[PDB]
Amino acid sequence: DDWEIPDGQITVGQRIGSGSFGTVYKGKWHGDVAVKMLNVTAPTPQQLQAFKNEVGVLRKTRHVNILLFMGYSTKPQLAIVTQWCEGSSLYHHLHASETKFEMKKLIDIARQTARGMDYLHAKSIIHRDLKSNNIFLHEDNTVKIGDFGSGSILWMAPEVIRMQDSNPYSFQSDVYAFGIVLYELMTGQLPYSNINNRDQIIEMVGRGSLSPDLSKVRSNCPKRMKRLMAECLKKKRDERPSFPRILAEIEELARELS
Ligand SMILES: CCCS(=O)(=O)Nc1ccc(F)c(C(=O)c2c[nH]c3ncc(Cl)cc23)c1F
């Protein structure tokens, strides 16, 4: 009904990391949790509404691939509480571990990711900033999608880079985001890897003249999964697939099997 954790109950220990959002610690509260304490000292009364309006959105997410919102503090600092996750994120795995993932295991991670996303949309939540860094792999099996509610241009649809008019952030923008995750998964690689220049990419992808190189997909990706990708990466936004049918193709190609 109300989800506030009164001062005292969370035992904050260890500083894991941060962001423009906030700073994230591990912690004890009826078991393990994570606490993202916002960059804010004195809560201005209109700021206690910014938060509780952002919280009312967070508590409309129940689902196994949507990070588990659990509670919000007020009294030591504005903060969001959630499940503690185990292991490391999709990014860490696809880049600075060198973990071989089999085609089987990679498709599943894509399946579980678009499971998160279709749910959020069914709920009318534009994520806005999906990427492999904000997909935490709990136990190295279960996708948990978080950090919803410059920054990272690599997952940014051309219309976002540039800017539509009345939108541009929308269900579709979330969809190009999802393709770039597909590229990462199905090439094990960040795109524009050879062209390492933020300005170049911002200017060249928004103008419609640089798009991911699909020849770097591992020779053993299915051709269903490869065509699915290039649909999502469409520069024209409304030619893009929306999420029901994205979640169809993936589960429905997943058989095959091993
Ligand atoms: C349910 C959506 C809440 S969120 O959008 O604000 N995302 C969010 C909120 C609070 C958090 F602490 C975190 C977060 O980064 C982690 C949540 N669980 C984790 N487990 C391990 C690590 Cl390393 C980080 C986290 C996080 F991703």
Domains defined for the chain, CATH in brackets? 1-86 (3.30.200.20), 87-258 (1.10.510.10)
End-to-end CA distance of the chain: 44
What residues contact 6, with CB distance under 8 A and at least 6 apart?
Answer: 75
136 annotated binding-site participant: no
Are the beta carbons of 94 and 132 closer than 8 angstroms?
Answer: yes
Q: Is 3 exposed, middle or buried (0-12, 13-18, 19+ CB in 10 A)?
A: middle
Query: How far apart, in whole angstroms, are the C-alpha atoms of residue 61 and residue 252?
Result: 25
Residue 88 CB: number of other CB atoms within 10 A? 15
Which residue out of 80, 127, 137 has the highest number of ligand 1 atoms within 8 Å of its CB and is therefore the one to mutate? 80
Question: Which residue puts its alpha carbon closest to atom 8 of ligand 1?
Answer: 147
CA neighbor of 179 nearest in space, from 250, 121, 122: 250
Q: Are the C-beta atoms of residues 81 and 70 closer than 8 Å to each other?
A: yes
Query: 3-class DSSP state for residue 122?
Result: helix
Helices (H), 146-190: 158-162, 171-187
The token pair at 26 is 């591990």
Which residue has 């304490």 as its token pair? Answer: 37
Compute the distance between CA of residue 115 and CA of residue 110 in angstroms, rounded to an integer.
8
* Peptide bond before residue 256 is cis, with ω within 30 degrees of 0: yes
Peptide bond connecting 191 to the previous residue in cis, omega within 30 degrees of 0:
no
Q: Are strands 22-28 and 69-73 parallel, antiparallel or unpaired?
A: unpaired
Q: Catalytic residue numbers?
A: 129
Beta bridge partners of 22: 38
Whether the Cβ atoms of residue 57 and residue 125 lie closer than 8 Å to each other:
yes
Residue 91 CA, chain-centre distance (Å), reads 11
Which residue in 236, 226, 197, 67 sits closest to 144, CA to CA?
A: 67
Hey, how many other C-beta atoms are within 10 angstroms of the C-beta on 125?
19
* 227-248 exposure pattern, b = at least 16 Cβ within 10 A, e = fewer: ebbebbbbbebeebbebeebbe
Q: Contact, 66 vs 119, CB < 8 A?
A: yes
Asked if 88 and 137 count as a contact pair (C-beta separation under 8 A), the reply is yes
Please tell me the distance from the alpha carbon of residue 97 to that of residue 10, in angstroms, as a whole number: 32
CA of 143 to the centre of ligand 1 (A): 13
